[PDB]
Each structure stands twice: as structure tokens, then as C-alpha cells.
Amino acid sequence: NIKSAKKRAIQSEKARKHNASRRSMMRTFIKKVYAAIEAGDKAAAQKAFNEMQPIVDRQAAKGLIHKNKAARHKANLTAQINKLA
Template sequence: MMRTYIKKVYAQVAAGEKAAAEAAFVEMQKVVDRMASKGLIHANKAANHKSKLAAQIKKLA
């Protein structure tokens, strides 16, 4: 489930759609944080995903 949301963000970034990428990023953040809080992934891994994708979205400006 988490990978699906991450792929959606990557797809929007690749298409150059900043608004859509930001919307997908918000959804992805919720899912990744939920997975980290349940212990399915490490908290640092969640932070790494969010940081990497936020930087790519920021480059779209």
C-alpha cells in the first residue's frame, strides 16, 4: 500500500505536475507516517521517503 502512494508521487513529479504532486505527497505522508507508527517500517525510513520526495517536488518550481 505504501509503495503505491510513493509511486503516485514519483509519477506526478516525472510528469512535471507540481500541484498534483503536492496533493499526492500529502496522501503519501499520511500513509508512510501510519506505517512507521505501527512499526512496519522504521521512522528514519519514513523520514527518508518524505525528505527525498519533498526535495523533488520543490525542484519543480
Template sequence: MANSAGSKKRARQAEKRRQHNASLRSMARTYMKKVVAAIESGDQAAAQEAFKAAQPVMDSSVTKGIIHKNKVARTKSRLAARIKAMA
């Protein structure tokens, strides 16, 4: 456990930041799952709309350092390919 005042504050800040990051990560994953659900339902228009909504959320999670840029690029590429294949 932290002893000095500075290290106690660091611990408080780290916990607050961890919870905030977890919230952002969860939100990004939810948007990704919505796209997958729309694809599996077979509705291309809904999948396209869900993908348009998910892209900025995924990109902002990269900017904030929540998810690695290559993982987001890979996920976006795979989702776009699946949506394109529905046509």
C-alpha cells in the same frame, strides 16, 4: 518443520503476519511511486496532492514497524524537495 502444537501455531501466525506486513509495505511503496510519477509528469498540483495522500500512509508504516523511521523521513524529505524544486 514445527512439531509441537505451540510451534505449529507460531508458524501459522508468523506466516499470516508476514503476508499482512508485505501488503502494508507494498501499499506504502505504491503511494511513494504515485508521488514520483506525478513529479515526473511535471504537474506540481498533482504531485502535492499525491504527497499529502502518501504522508499518513508512510507514517503509519513506521508506527507499525513496517519501514524504518529514518528511511521514511529521508524519503519524505527528498520528495518534498523535488516538489518544491518544481515551482
């Protein structure tokens, strides 16, 4: 019907695709941390986290996540690394 809705629709499809790419990118730099947590290496997990920390915190700043889910993923991975070794 309305001219608004059929622009907000294509706009939301574009934003869907772009947001989806960002979140399925960050869900790789968290699973790279997990694949080292289960691997039981302190150092490899340390690099995995020190590379995660921008990406999960970068878009929490300006997008998908916001500060509380970024805080959660930082915290409950620092905690898991600490008690790894």
C-alpha cells in the same frame, strides 16, 4: 519438532501476508508521487505527497518502516517537488 516453532511458523505466515499488503499499499502512494514528479506538475505531486504523508508515516509509527525510512521518503520527495517547479 517443537510445538513452539510450528505455531511461530503459521503466525509468521499470517504476519507475512498482512505486512506484505501494507507495504505493497504504501509502494503505491509513493509511486503516485513519482508519476507526478516525472509528470512535472507541482500541484498534482503536492496532493500525492499530502496523501502519502499519513500512509508512509502511519505504519512507520506502528510497524514495517520505522521513523528513519519514513523520514527519508518524506524528505527526498519534498526535495524533489521543491526543485520540480
